[PDB]
């Protein structure tokens, strides 16, 4: 009972196409991960199982690496965790890269788990490796990952008899490179990485007709515009706040392809993204390397101090449509929200609104969430007509990008009903 099918494309490998016309908001596929793990920066901040941020988390007894919010989460995680637990115990004080911990979970799921529904349309065995396009530099990095894997997993995997038949570690890490999904929480904070082999049939577009969203580790795939019969389904692999040049480099380095899409041919939005003084935004782009690192580790006080030094600098400033200024405004808004500084969060949040409209066209889940945050801030401060306007805009977007199957849509409906009741009274 599916509206999509695998097919062989003319020049981008296998892909997914619609077998019937699709309309905005239509759910096309949903999947738990084949395997997933919390990311470096969120380890110890979010529960290893449900990926939610809780202040009280309990370490697993044996390895004291995995953390859980509840007995329920520890129990539901134990099948995925039992064999890596001894390895993490084996390997402390060292912690292995996310990709190595992820592939460990793949190998254990394929060795010990029932066939996974995440592989319904496409399996880990099927995934693109791009090995004949990897540079010598990439291949050397892959060889280091293999040896790191062999080290980390020695307590549980000694020889090939404990790997799937004809399982090649080098090809396996090559697949992880170009098929890994970044798992975001409801607030669009990156909290994990996973493999979803059926979803990995989707080729990329800088102007996609589909979008994915995460509800915990669970993934929803939705159409975000009208799609004709037989049309290829695409998602955007990349953050929207990137120039065509930046997209080219990342698509080359990680995915081994050159994008022929119409936005890349025309450098669509590049000029407006880079307005302001070049010397100023080069420095902000540098500072953002540390700001985003701090944010990935949830160090909100330090994020905020670094952002304020830019937003309210004594030296030259950038227009809010400059993508690097815009990223700074967004980091500062999220830090204020997490620190309970709601007046400041709203000031930064409202400044992001018009640039987000430009740079996230149509229905994009990231703009839907940003608008909902600004609406919620306005609601908590008693600005009801303005909050209502933004909450309704968020719903117009998120009914398409998130849908009834995403728990966040229920929370938005509650905010809509509360803010409406405040206006009616």
Ligand X SMILES: C[S@@+](CC[C@H](N)C(=O)[O-])C[C@H]1O[C@@H](n2cnc3c(N)ncnc32)[C@H](O)[C@@H]1O
Question: Which residues are annotated binding-site positions for S-adenosyl-L-methionine?
Answer: 12-14, 122, 130, 179, 203-204, 237, 257
* 222, 243, 179, 405 alpha-carbon torsion, rounded to 10°: -20
If the CB atoms of residues 244 and 370 are measured against ligand POW, the closer one turns out to be: 370
Q: Which helix (H) or strand (E) holds 7?
A: strand 4-8
- 411 is an interface residue for ligand POW by CB under 6 A: yes
CB-CB contact of 28 with 222 (8 Å)? yes
Q: Out of 32, 168, 171, 187, which residue is the one contacting ligand POW (CB under 6 A)?
A: 187
Question: Which positions make up the binding site for Zn(2+)?
Answer: 47, 50, 60, 63, 69, 73, 81, 85
Report the phi/psi class of residue 39: left, alpha or beta, with left for phi > 0 and alpha for psi in -120 to 50.
beta
Out of ligand POW, ligand X, Zn ion, none, what residue 376 binds, judged by CB under 5 to 8 A for its kind, is: ligand POW
Binding mask 10-29 for ligand X (x = CB under 6 A): --xxxx--------------
Out of ligand POW, Zn ion, ligand X, none, what residue 14 binds, judged by CB under 5 to 8 A for its kind, is: ligand X
Q: Out of 376, 393, 397, 416, which residue is the one contacting ligand POW (CB under 6 A)?
A: 376
d(CA 269, CA 293): 26
Tokens 């999904």 map to which residue?
181
Question: Which positions make up the binding site?
Answer: 12-14, 47, 50, 60, 63, 69, 73, 81, 85, 122, 130, 179, 203-204, 237, 257
If the CB atoms of residues 78 and 125 are measured against ligand X, the closer one turns out to be: 125
Angle of CA points 201, 29, 373, to nearest 5°? 105
Query: Could you write out the DSSP letters of every residue in 106-172?
Result: HHHHHHHSPPPGGGSS--GGG----GGG--HHHHHHHHHHHHHHHHHTTTT--SGGGS-TT--HHHH
CB-CB contact of 417 with 398 (8 Å)? no
Minimum CB separation of residue 381 from ligand POW in Å reads 9
If the CB atoms of residues 142 and 256 are measured against ligand X, the closer one turns out to be: 256
Binding mask 118-147 for ligand X (x = CB under 6 A): ----------x-x-----------------
Minimum CB separation of residue 122 from Zn ion in Å reads 23
Residues in 233-272 that interact with ligand X by CB under 6 A:
255-257, 259
d(CA 135, CA 139): 6
Out of Zn ion, ligand POW, ligand X, none, what residue 47 binds, judged by CB under 5 to 8 A for its kind, is: Zn ion
If the CB atoms of residues 12 and 59 are measured against ligand X, the closer one turns out to be: 12
Minimum CB separation of residue 16 from ligand X in Å reads 8
Terminal-residue alpha carbon distance, the chain: 47
Q: Which residues contact 338 (CB under 8 A, 6 or more apart)?
A: 298, 300
d(CA 411, CA 373): 12
Count of residues touching ligand X (by CB under 6 A): 16
Out of ligand POW, ligand X, Zn ion, none, what residue 142 binds, judged by CB under 5 to 8 A for its kind, is: none
Task: Give contact residues for Zn ion (rule: CB under 5 A).
Answer: 47, 49-50, 60, 62-63, 66, 69, 73, 85, 206, 259, 261, 264
Backbone angles phi, psi at 302, to 5 degrees: -75, -40
CB-CB contact of 244 with 268 (8 Å)? yes
Q: Which helix (H) or strand (E) holds 313?
A: none
- 109 is an interface residue for ligand POW by CB under 6 A: no
Minimal CB distance residue for ligand POW = 376
Minimum CB separation of residue 128 from ligand X in Å reads 4
Query: Could you write out the DSSP letters of every residue in 34-90?
Result: SEEEE-TTTBTTB-TTT--B-S--EE-TTTS--EESSHHHHHHHHHHHHHHHHHHHH
Minimum CB separation of residue 11 from ligand X in Å reads 7
If the CB atoms of residues 186 and 332 are measured against ligand POW, the closer one turns out to be: 186
Neighbours of 123 (CB within 10 A): 16
Minimum CB separation of residue 374 from ligand POW in Å reads 8
Residues in 377-406 that interact with ligand POW by CB under 6 A:
377, 380
d(CA 202, CA 326): 29
- Which parts of this chain interact with ligand POW (CB under 6 A)? 186-187, 337, 369, 372-373, 376-377, 380, 408, 411
Rule CB under 6 A: which residues touch ligand X? 12-15, 128, 130, 178-179, 200-201, 203-204, 255-257, 259
């Amino acid at each position: 009972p599916l509206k999509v099918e695998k097919f062989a494309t003319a020049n981008r490998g296998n892909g997914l196409r619609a077998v019937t016309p699709l309309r905005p908001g239509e759910l096309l596929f949903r999947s738990d991960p084949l395997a997933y793990t919390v990311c470096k920066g969120s380890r110890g901040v979010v529960c290893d199982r449900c990926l939610l941020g809780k202040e009280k988390l309990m370490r697993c007894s044996q390895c004291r690496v995995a953390k859980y919010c509840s007995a329920k989460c520890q129990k539901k995680a134990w099948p995925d965790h039992k064999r890596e637990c001894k390895c993490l115990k084996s390997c402390k004080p060292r912690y292995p890269p996310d990709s190595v911990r992820l592939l460990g979970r793949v190998v254990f799921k394929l060795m010990d788990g029932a066939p996974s529904e995440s592989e319904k349309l496409y399996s880990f065995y099927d995934l693109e490796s791009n090995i004949n396009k990897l540079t010598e530099d990439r291949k050397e990095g892959l060889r280091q990952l293999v040896m790191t894997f062999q080290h980390f997993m020695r307590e549980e995997i000694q020889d090939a008899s404990q790997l799937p038949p004809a399982f090649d570690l080098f090809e396996a890490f090559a697949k992880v490179i170009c098929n890994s999904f970044t798992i975001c929480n409801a607030e669009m904070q990156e909290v994990g990485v996973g493999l979803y082999p059926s979803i990995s049939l989707l080729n990329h577009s800088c102007d996609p007709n589909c979008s994915i969203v995460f509800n915990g580790p669970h993934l929803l795939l939705r159409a975000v515009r009208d799609i004709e019969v037989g049309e290829e389904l695409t998602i955007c692999y990349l953050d929207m706040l990137m120039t065509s040049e930046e997209r080219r480099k990342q698509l080359r380095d990680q995915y081994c392809f050159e994008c022929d899409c119409f936005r890349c041919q025309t450098q669509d939005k590049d000029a407006d993204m880079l307005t302001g003084d070049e010397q100023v935004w080069k420095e902000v782009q540098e500072s953002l390397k540390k700001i985003e690192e701090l944010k990935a580790h949830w160090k909100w006080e330090q994020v905020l101090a670094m952002c304020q030094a830019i937003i309210s600098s004594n030296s030259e400033r950038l227009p809010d449509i400059n993508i690097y200024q815009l990223k700074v405004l967004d980091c500062a808004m999220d830090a204020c929200i997490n620190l309970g500084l709601l007046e400041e969060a709203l000031f930064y949040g409202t400044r992001t609104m018009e640039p987000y409209r430009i740079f996230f066209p149509g229905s994009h889940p990231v703009r839907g969430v940003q608008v909902m945050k600004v609406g919620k801030l306005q609601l908590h401060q008693g600005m009801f007509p303005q909050a209502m306007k933004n909450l309704r805009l968020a719903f117009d977007i998120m009914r398409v990008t998130h849908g009834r199957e995403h728990s966040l849509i229920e929370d938005l409906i509650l905010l809509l009903e509360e803010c409406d009741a405040n206006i009616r009274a």
